[model samples]
Target chain A: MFGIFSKGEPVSMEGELVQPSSIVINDYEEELHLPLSYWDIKDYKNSWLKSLGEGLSNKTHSALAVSMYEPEKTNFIFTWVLYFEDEKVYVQNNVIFLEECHGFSPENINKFIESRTTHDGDGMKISEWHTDLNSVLDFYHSLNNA
Target chain B: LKGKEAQEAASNLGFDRRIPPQKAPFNSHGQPVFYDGKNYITPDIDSHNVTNGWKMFNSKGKRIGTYDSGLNRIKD
Candidate 1:
């Protein structure tokens, strides 16, 4: 169950920085083998949720999955998961980081799901959800330029 | 109080009077700097390594620049 907390002071992003190397996208698609092995589904889901909450609470504009993997040193295959609500944008290098964002906030989660259902019935496959990361790249560049 | 005497005099003032250890404003990865009851939002050059630098964001959530070991801005 999602816990509740009165919105506190807006989270401060004063000193946070994005790691450039972490955002690089390699075009080479690693083969997706059949009989796909699935494990720790729930664990990863919860982890993503927690990370999303932290980001929103901090008001960082965007929350990256890389931060979640830092402490554990776990090598996640789909690494470029990012969520930004102000822009109504969700990006995931893997299949759908968008799904995780949908489950992020109880307040907005339903909104995303409803919109997705109305637009693309049955939704799109992780493979079909190809997002142009250039906007995100541009955002990063803007930060650097600033 | 020019050389050794100055050092001695400073030592006599106790650890409290000595310059407190300088804390970094941000971590190596450019995260926020926090300590005991305070938080710093600026980069601490002495605390960050610049040879291999990392990207950092400003208070407004805008990309600032990549910083090296010395916290020098590296051109993108």
Candidate 2:
């Protein structure tokens, strides 16, 4: 319900919440406004890492580093794992969940990261949560697969 | 209960949408990261705080150059 609107070049918001909203084409020069509450993004950083780690371990998958950051808001957190996969030091993942405990929908998060490709090109790659997650268990499934 | 509900309601509002990276870029020496349209250098992580690496629009929502954690610029 956070009010998300597309301006000329960037998106804008009222709260410091980070979620999926409509896309706006970049036409003119404009600034993006994000209303972020410090407390919320912090909560997410602490919780999401623990949850993500538990999820990854359960799935028998390994990652390099998971980093999270809130550029607009200073709140940021990250985690890294040094695990051997194919005799090479490949990064599993690095996440930076920013802005207080403001949770982001997986679908939206996917889109958000994918969008970065336009600028960074192939420099960034967000693995498939489905496979990366299955290496842990589909927590999406409320009931355990017993 | 109202407080908790308010918090939940606020979250339902969702945070602001994502914005493009600030137009200005900086180097390891805190200089402007200039690049032609094709190949440009992004902000360097080791140089400044993540915020400083990119240009942060001010509260007025104006493009206020690259982020400077120095005293001159107010914390965004």
Candidate 3:
């Protein structure tokens, strides 16, 4: 509602209680004025995705998620997983598709992750969450000595 | 609550007509997980605060790249 529909006039509702309307906006404007898109994507500076760098050997249930967004702005966030335990890694690369992604808002991102808050199929294979890590490490060591 | 019910209750609504993943990717459930910070958590209990790899994505929600589980990126 960034003054798109309203005629030229400085209308300020500063310090006023914003009314609830659509599932998307804090603005007083209606949902019709809101353009649909996951506009605000949050950034992770190597800290947020802690599951991506380390091994499953010592970690808890934490796992890496790869999200595949739906085409256009319909926005169905299909998130998959990479987890491990018992000397073996696992990959649950299916399920949990959250649609109408309204950006990474608390109402969106957190809940999107919550969609898969229960088990479905037996997560597939990937006994190499750390295999890739060690492979890289090994390559470096051999290179250093060679 | 049922999976479909939970999905509908989401802040952002899902497809009006839900289907199964096997039948059609976005239609069904793959597995269950928890929302831990910016990452997902399995039922596998363990630890963290380590330098795992990376999971980078574009605004369109595409996987642009990653640091890999080995924590290395293009050998740089």
lDDT tens digits by residue: candidate 1, A49-70? 5545544454342333322222
Judge candidate 1 against the unseen true structure and give its global Cα lDDT, from 0 to 1: 0.28
**Which candidate, 2 or 3, would have the higher TM-score against the true structure?**
3
What TM-score do all the candidates reach, one by one? 0.25, 0.23, 0.25
Assess the local accuracy of residue A26 in candidate 2 as a C-alpha lDDT between 0 and 100. Answer: 22
Tens-place lDDT per residue, model 3, A7-114, is 222222211111211211112221111111222112211211333334333433322222222333233433333343453333333334334433433223333332
Model 3 Cα displacement at A100 (Å)? 8.9
Cα deviation of A18, candidate 2, in Å = 15
* Deviation from native of the Cα of residue A128 in model 1, angstroms: 23
Candidate 3 wrongly placed segments (more than 4 Å): A1-48, A53-58, A68-75, A99-146, B1-76
Evaluated against the true structure, the overall lDDT of model 3 is 0.27
DockQ of 1: 0.02
Worst 10 residues of 1 chain A by lDDT: A28-37
The per-candidate TM-score of the B chain, in the order shown, comes to: 0.32, 0.21, 0.24
Best by lDDT: 1
Best by DockQ, which number?
A: 2
Rank by TM-score, highest first. Answer: 3, 1, 2
Residue B21 of model 2 has an lDDT of 22
* Real contacts recovered, all predictions: 0.03, 0.00, 0.00
Ranking by DockQ: 2, 3, 1
How many angstroms is residue B33 displaced in model 1 relative to the true structure, after the best TM-score fit?
3.2
